[PDB]
Amino acid sequence: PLCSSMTIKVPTDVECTINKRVVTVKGKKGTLVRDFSHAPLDITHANDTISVAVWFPRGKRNALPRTICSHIENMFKGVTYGFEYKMRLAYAHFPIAATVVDNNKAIEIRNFMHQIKTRRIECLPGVTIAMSTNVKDELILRGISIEDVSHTAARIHESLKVPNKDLRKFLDGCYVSSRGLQEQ
C-alpha cells in the first residue's frame, strides 16, 4: 500500500492541541504532554477525531500507527479517570514495614526478610502513594501518566530482591496485583 493509517475517537470531555508531533491533552484530572517527534508520522486533527498515517511504509514503519494511537488513548483515560496500581506486600515469618513519607512523594521500607538495610523509593512527579485504608498489606499508586505510575511500581519491585537463594522457595516481595483505572 501507499499509506497505513489508524483512527481513534476523541471524547467530549478533553481538549486536544497537536502541533509538530507534540500532543497536549487536558481534562479535569490534569494536563499531559508527550513528544512523538522521534518518528515520521502524518497526524491529522479534524472533525473531532484523530488519524495517524505513514506514507510508503516498508519494514517496521507499518508497526507505528497503532502504537501512537494507543499511547494517545492512555492519554485520554488518565486525564479523565486516572490510573491505579495496587501492590501487595508478601512475606513469611518477617512482616514488612512500610511508611509513606514526603507527603506521599516517597515511601520507606523496613525489615524485609529481617534485614538492616532500609529502602527509600521516591515517586516520579505527578504520582502519589498511599497505604490501603480498606484491606491490609496493600499499597496504592495513582496518577495520570501510565508510564509514570508503572515505572514507580516496578522500581519498588526491583528494590526487594532476595540474594543467593532458591527464589522458587523464598517468595517475599512486593507484587503488582491490579493494573486498572481509578473508580470515583
Binding site: 501507499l2 502524518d42 491529522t44 510508503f56
Partner: protein, 128 residues
Amino acid sequence: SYHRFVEAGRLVYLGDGPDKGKLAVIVDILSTAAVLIDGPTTGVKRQVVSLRWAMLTDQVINISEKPTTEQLKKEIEASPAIDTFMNSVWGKKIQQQRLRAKATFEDMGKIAKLRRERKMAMKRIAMS
C-alpha cells in the same frame, strides 16, 4: 501536513534530464519511481521521466483521464493555471534565469563591472 501531491494534472518543473528548465503536466502514474508527463504548450514531448527529475508546483490542471496531446493542449489553454505560476515569485525568478543563461564572455565582463557598482553604492548608502 502535505500540500503538494503526485496526481493527474499536477504541474511540474523539470530539474534534470535533456528537458531541464521547462514546465509540463502529469498524465499517468507508472509507480512511485516514474510518471508520464506531457507539456505541449511549453515545448515538451510526451515521455516517461523519473520522479527524481520533477519538482512539484502547487498547481493542478483539470484534465480528463486519458487525454491526447491535442485534447490536453486545449484543456491546458482553458485553464489560467500556467499564467498564475509565471506571476508568482518562483515564476519570476525562472524568467530571469533565462536571460542569464545566454550570456557570452564579453557580457560576463559587463555584468561583473556592474556588480562592482552595486557593491560600492550600497556602501555609500549604509554610511547614512
